UniProtKB/Swiss-Prot annotation, chain A:
Domain of life: Eukaryota
Identification of the protein by name: Nucleoporin SEH1
Endoplasmic reticulum listed as a keyword: no
UniProt GO BP: cellular response to amino acid starvation; mRNA transport; nucleocytoplasmic transport; positive regulation of TORC1 signaling; protein transport; regulation of TORC1 signaling
Keyword Nucleotidyltransferase tagged: no
Misc. comment: Present with 952 molecules/cell in log phase SD medium.
The species this protein was found in: Saccharomyces cerevisiae (strain ATCC 204508 / S288c) (Baker's yeast)
Swiss-Prot record, chain C:
Cellular localization per UniProt: Nucleus, Nuclear pore complex; Nucleus membrane
Protein's name according to its UniProt entry: Nucleoporin NUP85
Known partners and oligomeric status: Component of the nuclear pore complex (NPC). NPC constitutes the exclusive means of nucleocytoplasmic transport. NPCs allow the passive diffusion of ions and small molecules and the active, nuclear transport receptor-mediated bidirectional transport of macromolecules such as proteins, RNAs, ribonucleoparticles (RNPs), and ribosomal subunits across the nuclear envelope. Due to its 8-fold rotational symmetry, all subunits are present with 8 copies or multiples thereof.
Any further remark recorded for this protein: Present with 7920 molecules/cell in log phase SD medium.
GO cellular component: nuclear envelope; nuclear membrane; nuclear pore; nuclear pore outer ring
MF GO annotations: structural constituent of nuclear pore
Superkingdom of origin: Eukaryota
Family: Belongs to the nucleoporin Nup85 family.
Organism: Saccharomyces cerevisiae (strain ATCC 204508 / S288c)
Keywords: Membrane, mRNA transport, Nuclear pore complex, Nucleus, Protein transport, Translocation, Transport
Gene this chain is encoded by: NUP85
Task of the protein: Functions as a component of the nuclear pore complex (NPC). NPC components, collectively referred to as nucleoporins (NUPs), can play the role of both NPC structural components and of docking or interaction partners for transiently associated nuclear transport factors. NUP85 is involved in nuclear poly(A)+ RNA and pre-ribosome export, in GSP1 nuclear import, in NPC assembly and distribution, as well as in nuclear envelope organization.
């Protein structure tokens, strides 16, 4: 059915993420658990596949890797670590023993807020960002050793001037595009910046998405299937959804739309699988779906509520 | 202007103006399976949400397949070249047929929808979509730019059909409404009520002559008349005779028909008044309307489309006057904003076709897509856009190409998240046949979509591969494979 | 006043001389009345003659054939004739302002011209192509159309805000009024003025001092404005580049200015970059929006449909003036529906407008009403074109004007009517000619030459019979 269900978490849930096929969901909360749900074919219901304690502190971010590398999930916690897990199909579901830790990344010296796998066409790669204000890219150089996680790069996004106490939000989102040079977006407080791989194999800042007058709660790069330009949306605390058109002729930055329809902070901003629909959710307790006009402006095609 | 859907009506999470809670939402790889949740204390439920007004039905995919067949079958004819003499005539021949095919597929669909659920919000929208389409065919897919004389039969048939499928009135629930036989006024005869006549003219204005005759043989044909005034009995009778033979095939027979009618209205016009002061006029008006008096056709019209229709049926059957007919009609009765089809029809009739697409896209993305497509085939809308100093900018999915190309391609992309493997061929075919866009631009788009094909069978896999072959994406085949082993 | 009296009125052979009178006791005055809004001026007949020349000169090209150059060369000449028509009308409007002032007739003629500017800009320049085909001409016509439609921003309003009226300690440009009027200027392509309003208050002042960072933005932004491309759609592609670079640099940088002055400068830069959201925000009328979109966002007519829609969602069509709606119709494809309105402003302009629209092939005779036919003289009906109709009406209207100078125009118009039997025309001329206001010998010879040319024997015979009594006994 399509009625709600309990996650099984005691403390607040931070992130919910879909697998590649849209038939699985991974959940992480403050109770330091990662739950994975399965969408039973027969009874169209979501049912817990496995739950397990994974971190010593609150788990904030999560993400699945491309199916062409196996069943892999990654998690980021306030315990300054990022853990990788691989499903072992030879275990009963709900056993708490269905996902084996493949590794741990302790390089971060501050809590972590986000972790995102990179587009498959770049190998098992991933990024994370935390209080230390340092984005880090990791690579599973040898796709056979899903433990062989080397550190590919480190970039100082911010000056780290706020004690973890002073409001500090961070978000990541890679450019999904398969036929576009490697690059990813990063939000750190009021700022939002884009990184691009150089000829020297190092990340350089190629642009910034100006206009944010508060904390950026969320950002996501949209799948640019068909288009030549790129689009990344951001949900700010100042109560505005922003959609930036980024063209590389080297990167140009246009602001396409701004929307305050939410009157309050926009917490979640998400995209379609085709980058055809954009979603936003916020304080007003409403979810809005946006489509692009023929003129490339964005229009609210519907409002889901609470 | 947007749809304010009820996520999970039975149990909603946000209620208090209190702590504006952090709601988060993530769009899933499947249109019908998204998710909402909240980062707050004692809010640990997950809410699976499906995209507002999404069609998962089997009836719908059948419709989509049906339409894709017509599109594919149109061959080179789905394009319009701005065999020599006939290519023009033969082109319309096939396009006009395809239009009929589209209309058919949609009627069937609407049919299977009424049986399934009955009269759901979806049924209403699909009919509206059909009404706008009937109107569109009646005006551009029959006469091919010519006038009603070119083919009086087909035209009037489509017109009369369009009109009597747009709205329900006069609904038989209203026929009996006035035939209540309520005599709450000293001798309220069976017709002496303007109510009776308005509903008689209405029937005539809509070509509903059969019914029109019946409502007469209902009360005072022979009664009050064959007795009271023998003179007016003859008018009201052989008038009913003319109605019985309103020409629908020869624009000649009509020329002569309007003759006898005008003769009749003149004879009666100045003759033996052996009836009530009111019944006197109520019969002239009935005869004026049938003769085409413009003043009158507007008077007994409840909606602009009744006027418009009447004008063509009884005044002058020429589309060269539609511009004027429409104007007079709308001065009499404004466009009713209750329903979404009226305005689009007004636009069609008045030449600006392009502006029906946005509205139809709201009723149903699919219909709108193919509608735009066939309008391009007819050559009713074209890509006005242009390039540069002969010099990348390969963004298929844009305003660069047509408005039709745009709508078709969007529909393709929308199909990909539907997860119905039956339609994936439609999606890819739609993209592949897109009359605009580089073979390489398309290659890339398919290169990114294909990996999401919901294959299960062997035949499914062979299909994916055959497409990798056909487009030369071998590296991508070697990739879906890498998922097989590690699946 | 309310005495129900029998008023009688008789239309005279001359448009400008009719008569009203009353059949009642002590009402023995005769009231000569001339038909409401009739043009008797010399300026007008000059206009009519001028337009008839263009019509005559169009030759075979006044018709449209539903050798690869015949297509291209056809538009060439038609597009020029359109320019000729526009010219003749400007001249006319000119001679009218000098003679009678800004009277009711002046207003209507300008409205008529505005609708014509708009029509040219949309169909008589690009010939179905896009702005890249000819960026110079297009933008010129567009920018012209917009800045002749209405007067604002009238300099009487420029000083209105520079009133130096200090009443919560205004900083002369920290006011919202200042900016709206700056953007307005930009949206209308009025860049020269735009720059001036800046060099008016705080270019170097508050800025060169307060925040050196934003001084550079506001300055080299004014530099880009100075070189907005109007010839190369390439130069524009690169122009919008530097502009978007500028807005991004400034976007995230040193905020050494007021909280408001901060944004008031971003918006100025957003508008110039083409932010759709913004172009609509600082637009007072739909046509300012429409114009802006084309100038700063994407210069493609493939988007006009969308541009127009967004523009109208922001500001509705103003029913005060008669030109706005017709323009909306033009832009949105339904040209045919501007004729009825233009016919109200001026019968003449409307007639020839309809004519050249047929020449371009923007409107055509859809009629076809018989398979059985052979008398059905209809030179004056809906049977032929909507243009043919309007030209023929104008001809008939000219006949009651009593100006012998225009009679040739009247007859010529009927004679050249691209539709109607040579015999149908023969009859029409046969009935009109006798009313020609001849006086000279040359006048009479003209009548006759037309009776010859058309073979109206029994008519040249009556002209002469009137002459046997007004020529054999008059010129004595």
């Amino acid at each position: 059915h399509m009625q709600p269900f309990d996650s099984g978490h005691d403390d607040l849930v931070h992130d919910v993420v879909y697998d590649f096929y849209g038939r699985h969901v991974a959940t992480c909360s403050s109770d330091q658990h990662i739950k994975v749900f399965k969408l039973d074919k027969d009874t169209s219901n979501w049912e817990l596949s496995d739950s397990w304690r994974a971190h010593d502190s609150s788990i904030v971010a999560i993400d699945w890797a491309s199916p062409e590398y196996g069943r892999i999930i990654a998690s980021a916690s306030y315990d300054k670590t990022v853990k990788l897990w691989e499903e072992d199909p030879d275990q009963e579901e709900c056993s708490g023993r269905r996902w084996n830790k493949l590794c741990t990344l302790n390089d971060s010296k501050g809590s972590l807020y986000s972790v995102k796998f990179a587009p498959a066409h770049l190998g098992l790669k991933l990024a994370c960002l935390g209080n230390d204000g340092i984005l880090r890219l990791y690579d599973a150089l040898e796709p056979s050793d899903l433990r062989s996680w080397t550190l590919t790069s480190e970039m100082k996004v911010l000056s780290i001037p706020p004690a973890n106490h002073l409001q500090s939000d961070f978000c990541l989102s890679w450019c999904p595009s398969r036929f576009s040079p490697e690059k990813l977006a990063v939000s750190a407080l009021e700022q939002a910046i884009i990184y691009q791989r150089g000829k020297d194999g190092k990340l350089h800042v190629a642009a910034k998405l100006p206009g944010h007058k508060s904390l950026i709660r969320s950002i996501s790069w949209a799948p640019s299937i068909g288009r030549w330009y790129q689009l990344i949306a951001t949900g700010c605390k100042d109560g505005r959804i922003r959609i930036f058109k980024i063209t590389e002729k080297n990167l140009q930055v246009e602001l396409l739309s701004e929307h305050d329809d939410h009157n309050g902070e926009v917490w979640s901003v998400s995209w379609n699988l085709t980058g055809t629909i954009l979603s936003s959710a916020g304080d007003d307790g409403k979810v809005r779906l946006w489509k692009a006009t023929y003129s490339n402006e964005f229009k609210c095609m519907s409002v889901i509520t609470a | 202007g947007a749809i304010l859907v009820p996520m999970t009506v039975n149990d909603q999470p946000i209620e208090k103006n209190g702590d504006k809670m952090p709601l988060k939402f993530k769009l899933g790889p499947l249109s019908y399976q998204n998710m909402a949740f909240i980062t707050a204390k004692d809010k640990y439920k997950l809410y699976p949400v499906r995209i507002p007004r999404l069609d998962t039905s089997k009836e719908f995919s059948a419709y989509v397949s049906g339409l894709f067949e017509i599109y594919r079958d149109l061959g080179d004819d789905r394009v319009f070249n701005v065999v020599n003499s006939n290519f023009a005539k033969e082109h319309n021949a096939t396009v006009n047929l395809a239009m009929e095919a589209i209309l058919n597929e949609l009627e069937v669909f609407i049919g299977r929808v009424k049986d399934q659920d009955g009269r759901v919000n979806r049924f209403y929208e699909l009919e509206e979509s059909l009404t706008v389409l009937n109107c569109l065919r009646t005006m551009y897919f029959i006469l091919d730019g010519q006038d009603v004389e070119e083919n009086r039969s087909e035209f009037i048939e489509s017109l009369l059909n369009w009109i009597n499928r747009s709205d329900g009135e006069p609904d038989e629930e209203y026929i009996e409404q006035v035939f209540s036989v309520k005599d709450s006024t000293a001798g309220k005869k069976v017709f002496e009520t303007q109510y009776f006549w308005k509903l008689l003219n209405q029937l005539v204005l809509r070509g509903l002559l059969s019914q029109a005759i019946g409502c007469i043989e209902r009360s005072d044909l022979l009664p009050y008349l064959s007795d009271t005034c023998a003179v007016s009995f003859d008018a009201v009778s052989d008038s009913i005779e003319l109605l019985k033979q309103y020409p629908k095939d020869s624009s000649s027979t009509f020329r002569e028909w309007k003759n006898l009618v005008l003769k009749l209205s003149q004879a009666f016009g100045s003759s033996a008044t052996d009836i009530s002061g009111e019944l006197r006029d109520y019969i002239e008006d009935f005869l004026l309307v049938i003769g085409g008096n413009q003043r009158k056709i507007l008077q007994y019209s409840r909606t602009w489309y009744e006027s418009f229709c009447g004008f063509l049926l009884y005044y002058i059957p020429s589309l060269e006057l539609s511009a004027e007919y429409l104007q007079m009609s709308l001065e009499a009765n404004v466009v009713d904003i209750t329903n979404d089809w009226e305005q689009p029809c007004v636009d069609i009739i008045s030449g600006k076709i392009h502006s029906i697409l946005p509205v139809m896209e709201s009723l149903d993305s699919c219909t709108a897509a193919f509608t735009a497509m066939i309008c391009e085939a007819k050559g009713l809308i074209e890509n006005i856009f242009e390039g540069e100093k002969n010099s990348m900018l390969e963004d298929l999915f844009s305003y660069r190409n047509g408005m039709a190309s745009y709508m078709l391609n969007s529909f393709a992309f929308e199909l990909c998240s539907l997860g119905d493997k039956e339609l994936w061929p439609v999606a890819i075919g739609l993209i592949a046949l897109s009359a605009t866009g580089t073979r390489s631009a398309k290659k890339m788009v398919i290169a990114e979509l294909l990996p999401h094909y919901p294959f299960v069978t062997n035949d499914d896999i062979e299909w994916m591969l055959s497409i990798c072959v056909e487009w030369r994406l071998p590296e991508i085949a070697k990739e879906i494979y890498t998922t097989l082993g590690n699946q």
